[PDB]
Design a protein around this ligand. Sequence first.
Ligand code: CLA
Ligand code: CLA
Ligand code: CLA
Ligand code: CLA
Ligand code: CLA
Ligand SMILES: CCCCCCCCCCCCCCCC(=O)OC[C@H](COP(=O)(O)OC[C@@H](O)CO)OC(=O)CCCCCCCCCCCCCCC
Ligand SMILES: CC1=C(C#C/C(C)=C/C=C/C(C)=C/C=C/C=C(C)/C=C/C=C(\C)C#CC2=C(C)C[C@@H](O)CC2(C)C)C(C)(C)C[C@H](O)C1
Ligand SMILES: CC1=C(C#C/C(C)=C/C=C/C(C)=C/C=C/C=C(C)/C=C/C=C(\C)C#CC2=C(C)C[C@@H](O)CC2(C)C)C(C)(C)C[C@H](O)C1
Ligand SMILES: CC1=C(C#C/C(C)=C/C=C/C(C)=C/C=C/C=C(C)/C=C/C=C(C)/C=C/C2=C(C)CCCC2(C)C)C(C)(C)C[C@H](O)C1
Ligand code: SF4
Lengths: 42, 129, 742, 194, 170
Amino acid sequence: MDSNFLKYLSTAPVLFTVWLSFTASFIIEANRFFPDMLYFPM
Amino acid sequence: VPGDAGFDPLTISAWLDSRWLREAEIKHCRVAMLAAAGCIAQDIFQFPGAKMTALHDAAVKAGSMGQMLFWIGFVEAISTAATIQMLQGGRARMELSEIKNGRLAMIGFSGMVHHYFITGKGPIELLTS
Amino acid sequence: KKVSITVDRDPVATSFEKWAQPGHFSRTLAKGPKTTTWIWNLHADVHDFDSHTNSLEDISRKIFSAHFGQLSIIFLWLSGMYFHGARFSNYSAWLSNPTAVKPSAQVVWPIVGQEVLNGDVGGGFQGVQVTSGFFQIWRSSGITSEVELYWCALAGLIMSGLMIFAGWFHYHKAAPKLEWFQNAESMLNHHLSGLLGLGCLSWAGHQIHVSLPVNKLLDAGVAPQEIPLPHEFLVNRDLMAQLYPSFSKGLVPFFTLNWSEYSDFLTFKGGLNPVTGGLWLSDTAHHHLALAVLFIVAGHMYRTNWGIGHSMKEILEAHKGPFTGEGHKGLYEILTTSWHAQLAINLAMLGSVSIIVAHHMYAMPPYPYIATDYPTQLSIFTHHMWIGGFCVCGGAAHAGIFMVRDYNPAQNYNNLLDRVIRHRDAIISHLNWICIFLGFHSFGLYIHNDTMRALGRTQDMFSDTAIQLKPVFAQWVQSIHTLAPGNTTPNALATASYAFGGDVVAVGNKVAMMPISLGTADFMVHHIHAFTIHVTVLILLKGVLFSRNSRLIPDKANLGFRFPCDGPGRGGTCQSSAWDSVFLGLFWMYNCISVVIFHFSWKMQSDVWGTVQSDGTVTHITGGNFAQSAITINGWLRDFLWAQASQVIQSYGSALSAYGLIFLGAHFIWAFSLMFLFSGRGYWQELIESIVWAHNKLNVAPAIQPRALSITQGRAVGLAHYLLGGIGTTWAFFLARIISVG
Amino acid sequence: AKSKAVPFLSQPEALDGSMAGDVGFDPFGISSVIDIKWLRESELKHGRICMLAATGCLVQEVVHLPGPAFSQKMALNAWAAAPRGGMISILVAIGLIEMISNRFALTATDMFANPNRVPGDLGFDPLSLGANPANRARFELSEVIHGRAAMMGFSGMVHQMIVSKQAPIEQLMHFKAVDSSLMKLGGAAGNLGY
Amino acid sequence: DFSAAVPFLKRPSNLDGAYIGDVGFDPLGFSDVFDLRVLREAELKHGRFAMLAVLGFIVQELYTFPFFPKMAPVDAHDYFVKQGGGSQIIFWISFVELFGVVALFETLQGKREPGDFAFDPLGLAKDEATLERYRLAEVKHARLAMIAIGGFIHQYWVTKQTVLEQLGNF
Ligand code: CLA
Ligand code: CLA
Ligand code: CLA
Ligand code: CLA
Ligand code: CLA
Ligand SMILES: CCCCCCCCCCCCCCCC(=O)OC[C@H](COP(=O)(O)OC[C@@H](O)CO)OC(=O)CCCCCCCCCCCCCCC
Ligand SMILES: CC1=C(C#C/C(C)=C/C=C/C(C)=C/C=C/C=C(C)/C=C/C=C(\C)C#CC2=C(C)C[C@@H](O)CC2(C)C)C(C)(C)C[C@H](O)C1
Ligand SMILES: CC1=C(C#C/C(C)=C/C=C/C(C)=C/C=C/C=C(C)/C=C/C=C(\C)C#CC2=C(C)C[C@@H](O)CC2(C)C)C(C)(C)C[C@H](O)C1
Ligand SMILES: CC1=C(C#C/C(C)=C/C=C/C(C)=C/C=C/C=C(C)/C=C/C=C(C)/C=C/C2=C(C)CCCC2(C)C)C(C)(C)C[C@H](O)C1
Ligand code: SF4
């Protein structure tokens, strides 16, 4: 894959948008399978 | 240059490409050649299972004209590539014969079609009566 | 043939290399960041092409390809609007019951309890109610099925792909030369004749052959799947002649000039269709056909390649009299060498047209069943007032950028610009006086009324009951327009709009339109409007007129369009730039448009919208309280903001709880903006120093040294969150209120 | 200079045929981004875990420790049945093993800090079975291969336990085909949720 | 010069006999705009799919596997959408297409012919001459099968008869 295109995807706004979309996405998935967790179950 | 009787009274040649004019004229010639010969041909004989102007709409419902349109449309797409590549950059008698009979075909086809408006008949059908 | 196509082939190489080098387009930013200011300066100046390049050719090329990119986004946006209508909407159920089903084309996923937003919009459907008026457009278009909405969605996607290809192609493969862009006669001929003229004519053809037959069958009552497909009207001319018998004669009446034969489908009815509460589509077809003709006629005015036509330079240089010096000389050179001067005009006109669209569409409802869909009527009025106000302020923004940069006094000696700048004190002092007079004599009438009503003196108030400030000129114009059918528009059958007077049009027992009476409250709030518009003109005109120099700063043009100040001296020159008048004028635009939409919202609920029942009387949404309560500020606070905020505050636990959350969220963003507006950069840099120290202590200081935002960016960030917060509050308040009650 | 595993791709750098199991397979080019030493450490570790895990599933089908808490033929059911205290004992002991066997060089920046450290070579040869240097190359090859095969095999066994609520050997001996009326893949967004 | 196929059309100029099967037919000039390596990769990929599809039809009428129900190939598409084997085929094709994405990057980077996957298990290609003739035959068959594919699916729609049974009847 082109190294200048990979250097473009390594730029701060793309990584910030991708990482926080990935981060938001597994919070969303964790609340789909395991909803309404007000407390650590113990 | 072929078929030059010095006949451009309105001087269209001054304000449109002569190559474009010749291409359009010869295309009109050949289309009208086919159309006029076909118009007389239908009254001479009929293809199995198959009059001038309303038969266009008798044929569109089958899908015949639509299919013919699709194939003319395909050929005309490659032919628009042809005219663009023309424009972006013992036989002369036969070219002149083609262009002369084609102008005659344009007159002839116009006659047959407006004869249809007059009498609701095809060309040689009316000629017979 | 001096109008010719000229193109440089393969100008710019399609490479990913400059993608990997953020800031490549300017000499300052291309050497990389050293402070965080670089990051903000990167986004701030990126589309300022004439700040990167000297040549007008490369600037014009960047603009042309960026306009294709914008078109690609709009087509993608339109394609998605059709797809959500095709796939996630109750459109088909709404076609059967336009007066019962609420349009909805957005369905949420069930994640954190947010599926409460999928409210019962009707038609066996759950979703977010949509107010953009697409359903009414599609029925006006004659769509009648989700299958056709999928084909429109694909048509948008194909267009979206073709525009992004053309933007790439015309920047990287075949970029036109400057002499191509500098063909103003050719561009105007084609955009009048080709774009607007063939646009209207083709749309008229769709209306005549598709919209008119399909909508006649719908308004007769035929079920949507019982209606013939749109091409069976195109072929079966007998079937089209059933609905409109003039089609039995074909195109002979058009060519022989026997146009009166076409009166079946080319009418001049006026008024509204009683069934749908919309404009007669036979009128809209005639409207677009007539508009098409004179746009095609208008596009033959200018001279291109055959000697016939006008030279626009000759027209301008000839219009000069004894008051105006050399006249319009040099204006052609300005408008064919400055993109900002062109953008200033076109933004002010597009903003004006968008404001006109807001007024014309509520008063003369063009789509079937859009007049009694009150959430849509409020939404599209409010949306097009904001688009207009924003675009108008950008017209003065780019008039300032022209004056600071593209203005050359040598080429503008004693012409209209030279003469405007040379009496700008007389203009700004007279406008300043008008705004003081207007504020005292519009808003001071409200303050007089607050005091008199508070003092127990209701006989001393400016009211219909007490001292009366009647709008006689507006009432008189309303009289004339009701008298116009059969008198000064003799062949019209009904009025242009029932707002002027006349009948009450009811659809599904809801008022479509009815006369909008004008009283003292209407006199008062119209002069409120004239005051807020004049002050907005005052702030923006003073910025354009004093952009290059003042008595304060004699060399303001050397500092640029956008500078924060020229120091604390001369008493203080904070906010002295032309950019800083756009900044201050967007607040007063916000103030202006906020009162317009509040005036519209309260007046339509109080005096127009509502329910009809036996005896024909109308029960309005807020029961006619506008006349006696819009004359005091306390009335606007109590009977408009407090009374109508009930729906958005009590919305929690319903499908409108999203509006309740956005109400609070926008109140937050607005207040948060005041942190940036009331504060200064010097405080925030010194606070950052201590924060940098704690990082230095832990050896975690960044190599891109943090800075407080620039003085200008603090103003830009404050204004942006103020606008986002202010407008977002009204958006939620308007939408939750009118969905609940209208 | 083409790959031997994937003949139409170029042979990846950092793969030179020195390592055991090196056949030129890295189409996605992770070796060009991630040091091959870390990748081989992680491959040997994943494979050693999966050899134990695949053997764990099959033997746990056949042989049990005494008691009702250890009587789960289906290995996925053993996760819940096995005493929690002892399961967390296993987890804590694994963590202690991870820190000590790696000698506190645990991370991506300090494992292999010692130039003597070799990928996968933790000093574990209790019975000195790798003492013979003649068997060394084929042991390294067959360790890598057993690890890869067991990764694939354990992955299959787990997801066949999910699909068929049966232990692996008695899923082979009491086979039932997939009806497709249950366990359809995806679909969270097709029906728009629920 | 003029196009070999269309005498009156000029040669495209990005089609100078570099690829086997080049008759200069490119009126739309997609090769004046787009990379011809990408276009040739797609040509051979579309054609190989079409060839497997036409054979896929023919064999599927003649025989079908005993564990699967007998039915027409379009009905097979819908049945295997709802049965689960369609997603199987989609997953494994997509899996191979991942390494195809790597392959296309290798082609763009200059190091691979557009349709070459080094897939010669039976050693049928012997030397340069037979390989050039084989790849000319592959291109010609690939284009022809693409045409053929449209015919079988569209004709089944218009007349609900299978390709072999449609030749057998009418
Ligand atoms: C242009 C306007 C527009 C808008 C505002 C929306 C908005 C929406 N759509 Mg619609 N849609 C549109 C156009 C639009 N669509 C078009 C044109 C199509 C046809 C293809 C569709 C087809 C469609 C379907 C089929 C569905 C939606 C759905 C949705 C909803 C959820 C979308 C979502 O979360 O997916 C999120 C999906 C992701 C993969 C997340 C991606 C997030 C990344 C990180 C964004 C990053 C962008 C990137 C960084 C940009 C830089 C590129 C890079 C090289 C640097 C939302 C209401 C869904 C819905 O309504 O369900 C009920 C749904 O199922 N849309
Ligand atoms: C009849 C001729 C014609 C037409 C229709 C247009 C149309 C347009 N021009 Mg103009 N232009 C013309 C001639 C024409 N131009 C000439 C001769 C010149 C040289 C002087 C220019 C120079 C020029 C510049 C410098 C710019 C434009 C821009 C634009 C777009 C304005 C934004 C807008 O409203 O788009 C939305 C409205 C639409 C209707 C979208 C339509 C998209 C296609 C291109 C319209 C035409 C399609 C086709 C002819 C219709 C086929 C009909 C068929 C189905 C029967 C618009 C597409 C601006 C732009 O946005 O650039 C992209 C711009 O910056 N034009
Ligand atoms: C056709 C419309 C049009 C066009 C082409 C331009 C083009 C331009 N303008 Mg003009 N402008 C316009 C409309 C337009 N403007 C309008 C309507 C206004 C009134 C607000 C202005 C006011 C204006 C000013 C005051 C200035 C410009 C400037 C510029 C130039 C720089 C653009 C740039 O780099 O910004 C880059 C773009 C951004 C940084 C985008 C961020 C902007 C906002 C804050 C984000 C949008 C918020 C979003 C819509 C809502 C968010 C949702 C939320 C809930 C999360 C460029 C020549 C500048 C200049 O120096 O020109 C020489 C300048 O100072 N313009
Ligand atoms: C409620 C808040 C408020 C008020 C009253 C004003 C008032 C005014 N602004 Mg300001 N402004 C505001 C908020 C406000 N602004 C904000 C938030 C911004 C931020 C962007 C600005 C930015 C701004 C700019 C940029 C400009 C103004 C201008 C004006 C003037 C408009 C002319 C006018 O109406 O004169 C009439 C005066 C009033 C309506 C004030 C209220 C007077 C009422 C009628 C009662 C008077 C009582 C009487 C004097 C009592 C006497 C006795 C007593 C002393 C005991 C006026 C002085 C413009 C200006 O000065 O040009 C003329 C101008 O250019 N303003
Ligand atoms: C600090 C030392 C310590 C102590 C005091 C305990 C104490 C206990 N353990 Mg724990 N345990 C420890 C370390 C320890 N454990 C470690 C390090 C591990 C991880 C390897 C475990 C894993 C473990 C499991 C999985 C279980 C216990 C259980 C128990 C309880 C019942 C013991 C019993 O009945 O034994 C008397 C019974 C025996 C001695 C039978 C022994 C069976 C053989 C020896 C097992 C085979 C070992 C196998 C080969 C492991 C090799 C790997 C290893 C070398 C790394 C008891 C509270 C059980 C429990 O929670 O009960 C409620 C239980 O199920 N332990
Ligand atoms: C080296 C290890 C190799 C791992 C190979 C993976 C094997 C299993 C993969 C799927 C098998 C077949 C799938 C068919 C099943 C299938 O396609 O179902 C379709 C499903 C969407 O549902 P639909 O819109 O199709 O609903 C259709 C209707 O018919 C039913 O409502 O697609 C998905 O999004 C599910 C996958 C989650 C997508 C996100 C995954 C998590 C993201 C993590 C980061 C990226 C990782 C890679 C993402 C691709
Ligand atoms: C190193 C060292 C030593 C040691 C040691 C040790 C503990 C050595 C143990 C090594 C082991 C446990 C190797 C196991 C490999 C398992 C494989 C390859 C299984 C692959 C399964 C497949 C392919 C499958 C499958 C399946 C599928 C999915 C479908 C299923 O329905 C069924 C089925 C089962 C057929 C000691 C400690 C002695 C000291 C020495 O000084 C140094
Ligand atoms: C490459 C490779 C290998 C391999 C391999 C493989 C699998 C090779 C398979 C190749 C195939 C399947 C070629 C098929 C081509 C089909 C064509 C051209 C279509 C013809 C249809 C026509 C003209 C028609 C029609 C018609 C229409 C549309 C409709 C009808 O009503 C009428 C009609 C019937 C007239 C192996 C593994 C051996 C190893 C080797 O080392 C490398
Ligand atoms: C959607 C969907 C399905 C499907 C499906 C599919 C795949 C349908 C197939 C679509 C295809 C492949 C259409 C292409 C047809 C080829 C054409 C028109 C070329 C004609 C040649 C021409 C015009 C000229 C040629 C020329 C002439 C003059 C002679 C000289 C040469 C040349 C210049 C070339 C299923 C089955 C999966 C089911 C599912 O439930 C829904
Ligand atoms: S630095 Fe700030 S306070 Fe000082 S003159 Fe400039 S804008 Fe005003």
